[PDB]
Amino acid sequence: LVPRGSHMKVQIYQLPIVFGDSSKNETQITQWFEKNMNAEVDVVVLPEMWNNGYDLEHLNEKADNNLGQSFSFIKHLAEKYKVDIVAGSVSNIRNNQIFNTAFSVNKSGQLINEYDKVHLVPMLREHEFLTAGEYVAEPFQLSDGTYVTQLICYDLRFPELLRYPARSGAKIAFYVAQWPMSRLQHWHSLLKARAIENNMFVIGTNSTGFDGNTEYAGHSIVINPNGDLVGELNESADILTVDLNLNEVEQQRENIPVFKSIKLDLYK
């Protein structure tokens, strides 16, 4: 053991999300927590759209309502294992509109974050079935007090969304995704730059497998504030356990103080 206060042990579950089946998805997650959880794990990370996957045409019926089913499911697991869960995202109906809603729950079973994906793919029938988020991603604390941020899949292409959480003090950016195999290089390259430009840890938690339409990339990855690899996965399903040296954030921010030079009001 290392004395507490400078590290965080993270498990990334690179799950093969079942197309349009919330009960098979919930069973798989329960089984992954049972097989993999230990007293030393601080945070578990789940991929994007873990309840129904990309079964967009059936979300009008299959999606959750006000995170009812998904929050209760995650709260039960968080409390049972006394662990924080950066609970990917879920297809969620709110006031007769379908959102791609990310959320996190702490070890005390409290909802700590809720965020609807701001950036819809104007190609992936996402404009046909989903509604774009109307709020920025806000920094929030994990159980150790560490400020973090949670963004979803396509959001990775938008450097603007991470700037506000980074300058507010966020130390870890959790990107939750179902990133295609066809754009694997983009996934690693963008996550690495998000880490460097904001001097912070970046965790990319991706899904894997084929859903009858799209082959997902797998290849979940952890990048430190310097842009160096902490740990990674391949295409196949598995868990990734990393121990993050949190001190590297303030160290990187002292060495390359980008936010002392930012010109917020100038950029067009």
Binding residues vs a second copy (CB under 8 A): 118-123, 132, 134-136, 154, 157-161, 163-164, 185-186, 189-190, 192-194, 196-197, 226-228, 255-258, 260-263, 266-268
Burial of 259 (0-12, 13-18, 19+ CB in 10 A): middle
Of residues 77 through 106, those in contact with Cl ion by CB under 5 A are 84
Which residue, 142 or 222, has its beta carbon nearer to Cl ion?
A: 142
Residue 66 contact, options a second copy, Cl ion, none, Cβ 5-8 Å cut-off depending on partner type:
Cl ion
Burial of 185 (0-12, 13-18, 19+ CB in 10 A): exposed
Residue 48 is among the residues annotated as catalytic for this protein: yes
The runs of H, that is alpha helices, within the chain are: 22-36, 59-62, 68-81, 126-129, 160-167, 184-197, 247-255
Catalytic residue selected from 26, 48, 126, 248: 48
Q: Give the Cα separation of 144 and 83 in Å (integer).
A: 11
Which residue, 40 or 254, has its beta carbon nearer to a second copy?
A: 254
Residue 260 is among the residues annotated as catalytic for this protein: no
What's the closest the beta carbon of residue 256 comes to a second copy, in angstroms?
Answer: 7
Q: Give the Cα separation of 70 and 85 in Å (integer).
A: 12
Tokens representing 160? 């603007």
Which residue, 32 or 154, has its beta carbon nearer to a second copy?
A: 154
Sign of CA dihedral 90, 80, 106, 2: negative
Residue 61 is among the residues annotated as catalytic for this protein: no
Residue 42 makes contact with Cl ion by CB under 5 A: yes
Which residue, 28 or 197, has its beta carbon nearer to Cl ion?
A: 197
DSSP state of 34: H
DSSP state of 225: T
Binding segment for Cl ion (CB under 5 A), chosen from 9-17, 54-62, 160-168, 179-187, is 179-187
For Cl ion, which residue of 85, 142, 233, 244 counts as binding (CB under 5 A)?
142
User: CB–CB of 90/70 below 8 Å?
Assistant: yes
Which residue, 7 or 186, has its beta carbon nearer to a second copy?
A: 186
Q: Give the Cα separation of 81 and 37 in Å (integer).
A: 7
What's the closest the beta carbon of residue 140 comes to Cl ion, in angstroms?
Answer: 11
Catalytic residue selected from 26, 153, 171, 248: 153
Residues binding Cl ion (CB under 5 A): 42, 66-67, 84, 142-144, 183
Enzyme catalytic residues: 48, 117, 153
